[PDB]
Amino acid sequence: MIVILDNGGQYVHRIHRSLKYIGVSSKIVPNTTPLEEIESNKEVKGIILSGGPDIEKAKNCIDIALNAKLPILGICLGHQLIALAYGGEVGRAEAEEYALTKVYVDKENDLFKNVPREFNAWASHKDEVKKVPEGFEILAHSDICQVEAMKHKTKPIYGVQFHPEVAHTEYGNEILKNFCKVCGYKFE
Numbered sequence: 001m002i003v004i005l006d007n008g009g010q011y012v013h014r015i016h017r018s019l020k021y022i023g024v025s026s027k028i029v030p031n032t033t034p035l036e037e038i039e040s041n042k043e044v045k046g047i048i049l050s051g052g053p054d055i056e057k058a059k060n061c062i063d064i065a066l067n068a069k070l071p072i073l074g075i076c077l078g079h080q081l082i083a084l085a086y087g088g089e090v091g092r093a094e095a096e097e098y099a100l101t102k103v104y105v106d107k108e109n110d111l112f113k114n115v116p117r118e119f120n121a122w123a124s125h126k127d128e129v130k131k132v133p134e135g136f137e138i139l140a141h142s143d144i145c146q147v148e149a150m151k152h153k154t155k156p157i158y159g160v161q162f163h164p165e166v167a168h169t170e171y172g173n174e175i176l177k178n179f180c181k182v183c184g185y186k187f188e
Helices: 013-022 061-066 078-086 173-182
Strands: 002-005 026-029 047-049 072-075 090-092 100-103 119-122 127-129 136-140 149-152 157-160
Touching (some): 002 013, 013 026, 047 078, 072 173
Parallel strands (some): 002 026, 047 072, 072 157
Antiparallel strands (some): 090 127
16 A cells, blocks of 8 residues: 655645545555654555655654655655755755746656656746755656656655646646556555
8 A cells, every 4th residue: 555644745635636536545644643653564565755845844754765665756845855865955946836847758667657758747946956966867857847857776766846746737647647556556
């Protein structure tokens, strides 16, 4: 089963709601709870790091860094959580909302399935990684948001700046539906 942990972001309902419509069993867990709660289930298949204001205010962020054993897909602040964890940096670029984010021929052929090479997708340039850590590689880069998606090779870790949870997210539900499905698979 998939586990969804929130780090301050109230946009987690989109994670559990989407998975449901996709046919993937998952449960949401608050940050107030102890890390042992999520660390006690090492059998899980995948994890989703809901958005949030800052992952530097919660102590659970440390658990996500050591829980890399499983495929964790971070959103909004998620991608930023992996950076500070590896020793990177993050800042603000464009707080604007109404903006375009086209992505050229780039994909890990894993979660970006059912997606073409050149397509226009929605994404806010609020905050994105400003540092370039070692061991991580971008799977999808946009003409404006090159850090649209970052995955580590050393371990099964994934991160994204855009919010694929929302419906308006063009070509976003694909990465959220493809991933949640890859790890969503359960046994009876």
